[PDB]
Design a protein around this ligand. Structure first.
Ligand SMILES: C[S@@+](CC[C@H](N)C(=O)[O-])C[C@H]1O[C@@H](n2cnc3c(N)ncnc32)[C@H](O)[C@@H]1O
Ligand SMILES: C[S@@+](CC[C@H](N)C(=O)[O-])C[C@H]1O[C@@H](n2cnc3c(N)ncnc32)[C@H](O)[C@@H]1O
Lengths: 236, 209, 236, 209
C-alpha cells in the first residue's frame, strides 16, 4: 500500500519529505494508475499553497536540468568514456604488435616501445580517474549505486543525461557493455544464478531513478543505496 | 465574434483575453494576445471550425509543451485551472521556463511523456489531455497517458503528423489507420486537417466514456 | 641481342663481370629459351674450370641465403612495418577521440592527451628510422631504387625475403599498399599518365632483381639504379 | 643384380656405387650407399620396376632438391655429369649445401622453380628434368622448365601427389587428368604408383620429340 506522490508517501496517511519535495518529485514512481486524486490527497496535506508549492518545485528541477544542459558536463564525460576504451584498444593491439617484434629480436627499440605503452597505460589510468571526478559531481546518486566506472558507461551508451533519464529499467539492465554491465555489480554477482535476475530488475529500476535525481537534483539520496542493500539481504 | 472561453476574433485576428506579454509573437494589444495560427496547431483547429467548450476551472495535461507557444494560450483559456506541461528536450524547455515564470498556472514536467507512470505521482486526474507529439508511437503515448489521468468522461485533442507515423504512405491512408486505431479507446468528435496552416497535421477531438 | 648468362653478356662476344659472377648469377635474366648452350658459350670463355667456378659461385649465394635466414633480420623488419602502421592507426583514432573531448571542454587532461599523442607520434618517427637502418643493410639494392619506406613495405606485404624474391614483376607493381606503392616513385609519378605504366613494368622488373641480389649478395649494384634513370630519360 | 648406371641390389638392399658419406641414412658399406626407398620417390620407382638407362656423362636438372636425399643418389648415378638442383625453401636448403659441399657434381639453385626464365642463364640444355615438386601447378612448372632447357629428345621423370593438385577428388581421376594434361607435350613411357613406399604418389616417365 505504498504510493509515491510528489509530497510524500500515502497509504491512508501521509509522510512528507524533509524540505525535499524536489526529491520525491523526481521520485513519484508509481507503476499503475492511482485510485485517488493526488491533488485532493494533497489538499488534505498542504494548505491552499498546494499549487504554489507544487509549482515552485516543478520549477526548481526544470531549472537544474537547463542549468546542467548549459554546462554540458555530461557530454565531456561521454567523450571521455569513448576515448578511454579507445586508448585501451591501442594499449592492446600495440602489445600484440610488440610481442610480434619481440618474438624475433629484442632490439633497443622494443624498449622504447615498452615505455611508450606504459606512458600510454598511464593516460588510461588518467582518464579513468577523470570520469570518476566528474561522475561523483554530475552524477552521484548513480556512481553511488554501481560505481563511477559503470555509471559512466551507461551514460555514454545512453548518449547524454536527458537521453538516459528516459530509458526504461529494462533497457538499463541490458544496454550494458555492447546481461548488461549492471550485471557485474556485487549485489547481482553474489546470488544464485536464477534469482540474480530479480536483483538486476530492482537495481535497474532504482538506478533509472538515481539517474533522474542526479540530473534534476544533483544531490545524493541514500534512500537509494538503502533500498538496494536491503532488497539484497532479502535475497536468501 | 466569440468562439471559446477567452477566444475572440478581433477584426480578423484570433486572440485570447490576457494581461500577459508576448512569448513568441509580440502580438499583444489592450488585454489580448494574437494567436498566430501559423505557430499553433490549436489556434488553427479553432479557425478550421471545430472548437473546445470549457470553463476556466479546468485541469489540463499538455503532452508536448515545446517552447510553450500553443501552451501560453491555453493558459489564457484555462485561467482558473492548472496546466501540467510535459516536454523532454532541454533546448525548447529552456524557453518554456520563461513562460511558467511569467504565468502562474502552468506546471513544468521535464520528463519523457512516453512513460506516464514515471510522473504518475504528480499529475492529478485531468479533464483533458492535449497532445502535439510527433513520433511513431503517438497514439500509444496518448492512450497510456489517458489511462493514468484522463478522468472518466474526459476529453482529448491530439495533433497528428501523418509522416511521423508512416514514412512512406499516403497521408490519407495513414490518417485512415490512426483514426481506426484510436477509436478502440475514445469516442470521436471531429477530425479535420489544418490544411492552410499545417499542411501535414490533422486534429482529432474525442473522449473516453 | 643482349643475353644475361651467369658469367657475362653474350651476343656473339663476351663481357665478364669484375670478379662478380655472384652478381650476374643472380642477374641471369632472360625471358625466353636461349638459342645456345650457356655451357658451351661458357666453355669458350672460362677454361675447364667452368664447372668449378660455376659451382663456387652457386655455393656462395646459397650460403648467404642460409646466412640471412639464420639471422632472420628480414622478419624483424616485417614486424617493424606491421607495428608502424599500427602505431599510426592509433595516432589517428586518438586524435579523433581528443578533438571529440576538445569540441566540448578544453580540460587540463586534454593536454596530457596532446603530449601523449606527440610522445606516440615520436615512437612512429622512431620505428620509421629503424626500418631505414636495417633496410639499408639487409636490403640496399632495393632501398636504393624505391627508398627504405617503400622497399620495406613490399617486404612486409611479401612476407619475408625468400617469399618476396619469388614474386613476379607483375605482382610487385600491384602488391602495393593494399597502382601499387611502386607507382608513387618519382620516375613513375612524373610522366604522362598512360606511359607511366610502362615505367612501373620496368621498375618492377628491375626491382624484383634488386630484391634477389640483396638477399643473395647483400651488396649494392648501381647497374640497377643506372638502368632505371636511363630508361626514365628515354621516356619522352 | 644390376638395374642402373651405378645401381645394384646388395642382397636385397637397393644401393648406389659411391665413395661418399651418409647424407641421411648412415647406410654406407664398402663403396655403396643404401638407397632408402622410404626416403626417395626415385629409389621406389626403381623398385616398382621401371628404371632409367643413362651414361654417367649426363646433364641433370632437378626441380625439388629438397634436403638432398633423392639428389645425393642421382649424383652417384651421374658421376660423370652435372646436377643443377633447385630448391626455394631455406630450411631444407640449409641441409642441401652440406651435400653440394661434400660432392663436386651438384650445382645449387636457390630459386623458385615456378619461373625458369629467372635462372635461364645458368641452366644449360639438360638431358633430363627430374621433378618432385608437390604443388597445384605441378605439370605447368614441369612444362615450362622443359621448354627452356630440355634438349629435343630429352627425357623427364616427374613425381606426383594426387592431393597436391586436387584437394578432394579420387586419386585415380586426378592421375587420370594429369596424365592427359601432360600428354600434350611429352610422350609417355610409363606410369606406376609407388604404392608401398609412397601411398599418394605416382611416377610418370616421358620425353618430348
Ligand atoms: C510538433 S512539436 C510541438 C510544437 C508546439 N506546438 C510549438 O508551438 O512549439 C512536438 C514536441 O513534442 C515533444 N516530444 C516528442 N516526443 C516526446 C516525448 N516522448 N516526451 C516528451 N516530449 C516529447 C518535442 O520535444 C517537440 O517539441
Ligand atoms: C615432395 S618434396 C621433396 C622430397 C625429397 N624427395 C626428399 O627426399 O627430401 C618437394 C620439394 O619441392 C620444393 N618445392 C615446391 N615448390 C617449389 C617451387 N616452386 N620452387 C622450388 N622448390 C619447390 C619444396 O621446397 C619441397 O622440398
Amino acid at each position: 500500500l505504498r504510493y509515491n506522490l510528489w509530497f510524500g508517501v500515502y497509504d491512508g496517511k501521509e509522510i512528507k519529505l524533509s524540505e525535499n519535495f524536489e526529491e520525491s518529485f523526481l521520485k513519484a514512481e508509481n507503476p499503475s494508475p492511482l485510485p485517488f486524486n493526488v491533488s485532493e490527497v494533497g489538499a488534505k496535506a498542504l494548505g491552499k499553497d498546494y499549487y504554489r508549492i507544487l509549482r515552485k518545485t516543478a520549477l526548481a528541477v526544470s531549472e537544474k536540468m537547463v542549468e546542467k544542459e548549459l554546462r554540458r558536463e555530461d557530454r565531456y564525460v561521454v567523450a571521455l568514456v569513448k576515448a578511454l576504451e579507445e586508448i585501451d584498444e591501442s594499449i592492446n593491439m600495440l602489445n600484440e604488435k610488440l610481442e610480434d617484434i619481440r618474438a624475433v629480436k629484442e632490439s633497443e627499440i622494443t624498449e622504447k616501445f615498452e615505455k611508450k605503452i606504459r606512458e600510454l597505460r598511464e593516460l588510461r589510468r588518467d582518464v579513468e580517474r577523470e570520469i570518476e571526478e566528474v561522475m561523483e559531481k554530475i552524477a552521484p546518486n548513480m556512481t553511488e549505486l554501481v560505481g563511477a566506472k559503470v555509471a559512466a558507461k551507461l551514460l555514454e551508451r545512453a548518449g547524454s543525461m536527458e537521453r538516459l533519464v528516459r530509458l526504461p529499467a529494462s533497457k538499463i539492465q541490458v544496454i550494458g557493455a555492447e546481461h548488461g554491465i549492471i550485471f557485474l555489480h556485487p549485489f547481482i554477482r553474489t546470488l544464485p544464478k536464477a534469482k540474480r535476475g530479480k536483483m538486476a530488475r530492482f537495481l535497474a529500476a532504482k538506478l533509472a531513478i538515481a539517474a533522474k535525481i542526479d540530473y534534476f537534483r544533483g544531490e545524493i539520496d541514500e534512500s537509494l543505496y538503502e533500498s538496494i542493500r536491503r532488497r539484497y539481504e532479502e535475497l536468501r | 465574434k466569440e468562439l471559446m472561453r477567452n477566444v475572440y476574433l478581433l477584426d480578423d485576428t484570433l486572440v485570447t483575453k490576457s494581461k500577459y506579454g508576448s512569448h513568441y509573437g509580440e502580438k499583444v494589444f489592450d488585454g489580448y494576445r494574437e494567436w498566430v495560427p501559423w505557430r499553433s496547431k490549436l489556434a488553427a483547429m479553432i479557425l478550421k471550425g471545430h472548437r473546445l467548450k470549457l470553463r476556466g476551472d479546468e485541469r489540463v495535461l499538455y503532452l508536448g509543451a515545446a517552447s510553450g507557444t500553443t501552451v501560453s494560450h491555453l493558459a489564457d483559456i484555462v485561467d482558473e485551472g492548472i496546466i501540467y506541461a510535459v516536454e523532454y528536450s532541454a533546448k525548447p524547455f529552456e524557453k518554456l521556463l520563461e513562460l511558467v515564470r511569467e504565468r502562474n498556472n502552468i506546471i513544468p514536467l521535464l520528463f519523457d511523456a512516453s512513460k506516464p507512470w514515471k510522473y504518475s505521482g504528480i499529475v492529478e486526474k485531468v479533464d483533458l489531455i492535449y497532445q502535439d507529439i510527433a513520433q511513431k508511437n503517438q497514439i500509444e503515448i496518448l492512450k497510456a497517458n489517458a489511462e493514468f489521468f484522463l478522468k472518466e468522461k474526459g476529453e482529448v485533442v491530439i495533433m497528428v503528423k501523418a509522416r511521423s507515423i508512416d514514412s512512406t504512405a499516403e497521408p490519407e491512408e495513414v490518417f485512415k489507420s490512426v483514426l481506426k486505431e484510436m477509436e478502440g479507446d475514445f469516442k470521436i468528435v471531429k477530425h479535420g486537417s489544418l490544411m492552410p496552416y499545417h499542411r501535414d497535421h490533422i486534429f482529432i477531438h474525442a473522449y473516453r466514456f
